[PDB]
């Protein structure tokens, strides 16, 4: 049930209304949406992959994660774009002990671009460990990864990395939003359409999905799933679905868009597409 932008921007204002309680409810039907499909997730609660989940309740669902080849467990799903099924990889910061699973994973998905929506730190709290050289080379099984360049704008920054088997090349090139704020969301979405735009625009036509990730892989990664999908379809067709499309990647991954407040936001996002 695609609907037209003319009334998703005619109604909308409804949903805004009432101190948002139209979202709200939306939201938790989204909450629901999942609860009796008794989604497999076996491989993350193996006793023995257990310290490889950042965090002991955000797992991937066996049918969409992520297998390293030929101990291939990674916490990790393809999510769909819009229009291309396995478009993206959402995934956890990684971990000091799952860096080498990260990058091994990075070169045989074949993904050229990586989103990160997180600080490493935020508040004193610890949100993702630092899985790239900070300058020169740093070797994670046998992929060396070499850091380019670097450049750095208001809301995010640019990395261009050169990565490499050690048993062939690649640029693999990463986006890290950097002024998300401590609690909540950004306040203007425009910061982040213009990251979406520039990162989602990075993606090269023959190559693997594009690795989004924040802390638990879920909230802010979800939403940028969403704005990022959403505005192709209106580019292409002028329609939108974020309900609809929102229900179907949240069986690829549990919690993609963890929030209401998140869920709002994706909806300031594309408004403000809209209408620029
Ligand atoms: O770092 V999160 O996937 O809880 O937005």
Same mark, same amino acid.
């Given at each position: 049930?695609?609907?037209?932008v003319k009334?998703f921007?005619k109604?909308?204002?409804?949903?805004?209304?009432?101190?948002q309680?139209?979202?709200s409810?939306d939201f938790?039907?989204?909450? @629901?949406?999942?609860?009796?499909?008794?989604?497999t997730?076996?491989?993350?609660?193996?006793?023995?992959?257990?310290?490889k989940?950042?965090?002991i309740?955000?797992?991937?669902?066996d049918?969409? /994660?992520v297998?390293?080849?030929?101990? !291939?467990?990674?916490?990790?799903?393809?999510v769909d774009?819009?229009?291309?099924?396995?478009?993206?990889?959402?995934?956890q910061?990684?971990?000091?002990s799952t860096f080498?699973d990260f990058?091994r994973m990075?070169?045989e998905?074949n993904t050229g671009?990586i989103?990160?929506?997180?600080?490493?730190?935020?508040?004193? /709290?610890?949100?993702?460990?630092?899985y790239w050289?900070?300058?020169?080379?740093?070797?994670?099984?046998?992929?060396?990864?070499t850091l380019?360049?670097?450049?750095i704008?208001?809301?995010y920054?640019?990395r261009?990395?050169?990565?490499?088997?050690?048993?062939?090349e690649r640029?693999?090139?990463?986006?890290?939003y950097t002024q998300?704020? !401590?609690?909540?969301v950004p306040?203007?979405?425009?910061?982040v359409?213009?990251?979406?735009?520039?990162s989602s625009?990075?993606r090269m036509?023959?190559?693997?999905?594009?690795?989004?990730?924040?802390?638990a892989?879920?909230?802010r990664?979800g939403?940028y799933?969403?704005? !990022?999908?959403?505005l192709?379809?209106?580019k292409?067709?002028?329609?939108?679905n974020?309900?609809?499309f929102?229900?179907?990647?949240?069986?690829? @991954?549990?919690?993609?868009?963890?929030?209401?407040?998140?869920?709002?936001?994706?909806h300031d996002?594309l408004?403000?597409?809209?209408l620029g």
């Amino acid at each position: 049930e695609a609907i037209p932008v003319k009334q998703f921007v005619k109604h909308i204002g409804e949903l805004y209304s009432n101190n948002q309680h139209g979202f709200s409810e939306d939201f938790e039907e989204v909450q @629901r949406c999942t609860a009796d499909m008794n989604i497999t997730a076996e491989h993350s609660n193996h006793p023995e992959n257990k310290h490889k989940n950042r965090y002991i309740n955000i797992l991937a669902y066996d049918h969409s /994660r992520v297998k390293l080849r030929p101990s !291939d467990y990674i916490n990790a799903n393809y999510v769909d774009g819009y229009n291309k099924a396995k478009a993206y990889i959402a995934t956890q910061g990684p971990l000091k002990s799952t860096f080498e699973d990260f990058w091994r994973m990075i070169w045989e998905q074949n993904t050229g671009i990586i989103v990160m929506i997180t600080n490493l730190v935020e508040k004193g /709290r610890r949100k993702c460990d630092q899985y790239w050289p900070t300058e020169n080379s740093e070797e994670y099984g046998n992929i060396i990864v070499t850091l380019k360049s670097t450049k750095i704008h208001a809301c995010y920054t640019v990395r261009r990395f050169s990565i490499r088997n050690t048993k062939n090349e690649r640029v693999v090139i990463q986006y890290h939003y950097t002024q998300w704020p !401590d609690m909540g969301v950004p306040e203007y979405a425009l910061p982040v359409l213009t990251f979406v735009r520039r990162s989602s625009a990075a993606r090269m036509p023959e190559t693997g999905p594009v690795l989004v990730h924040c802390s638990a892989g879920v909230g802010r990664t979800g939403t940028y799933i969403v704005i !990022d999908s959403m505005l192709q379809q209106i580019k292409d067709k002028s329609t939108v679905n974020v309900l609809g499309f929102l229900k179907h990647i949240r069986t690829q @991954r549990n919690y993609l868009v963890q929030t209401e407040e998140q869920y709002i936001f994706i909806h300031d996002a594309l408004l403000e597409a809209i209408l620029g």
